[PDB]
Design a binder for this molecule. Structure first.
Ligand SMILES: Cc1nc(C)c(CO)s1
Length: 147
């Protein structure tokens, strides 16, 4: 029927169908389009107080709750999708990962190297596609597949 991990949903506010991916947490109105040894991704990480290491170059002690980190992620996704802000610009300014300095770029990787929910979302994204909120022991990520 549909690509890996996609399913139909109903908007509660508009009543129009939409499509949701339970591996990447992406959602969109349009029916999704149409695996490689390696993919290349960038990400934007927002850490919270239960992150495996609750610190970053932005904050020595990260104190924000999981709830608060998800609200930040949600807000960044809105600005990226509206075009008010670029993914790369938001990642350089606000990502709690050292990769912020590289506009979020992580380089290329195979299966078995990254944390598993990050890995599964990365490989389920098509080239150019961006994830919804993806949760790992590091925190909450927005993932952009670039290759
Ligand atoms: C975890 C990472 N830190 C930096 C600066 C990278 C470069 O791509 S990846």
């Amino acid at each position: 029927k549909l690509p890996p991990g996609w399913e139909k949903a109903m908007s509660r506010s508009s009543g129009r169908v939409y499509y949701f991916n339970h591996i990447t947490n992406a959602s969109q109105w349009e029916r999704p389009s149409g695996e490689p040894a390696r993919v290349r991704c960038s990400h934007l990480l927002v850490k919270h107080s239960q992150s495996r290491r609750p610190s970053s170059w932005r904050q020595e002690k990260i104190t924000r709750t999981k709830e608060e980190a998800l609200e930040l992620i949600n807000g960044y996704i809105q600005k990226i999708k509206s075009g008010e802000e670029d993914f790369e610009s938001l990642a350089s300014q606000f990502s709690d990962c050292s990769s912020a300095k590289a506009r979020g770029d992580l380089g290329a990787f195979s299966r078995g190297q990254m944390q598993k929910p990050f890995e599964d979302a990365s490989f389920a994204l098509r080239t150019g596609e961006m994830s919804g909120p993806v949760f790992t022991d590091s925190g909450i990520h927005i993932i952009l597949r670039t290759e």
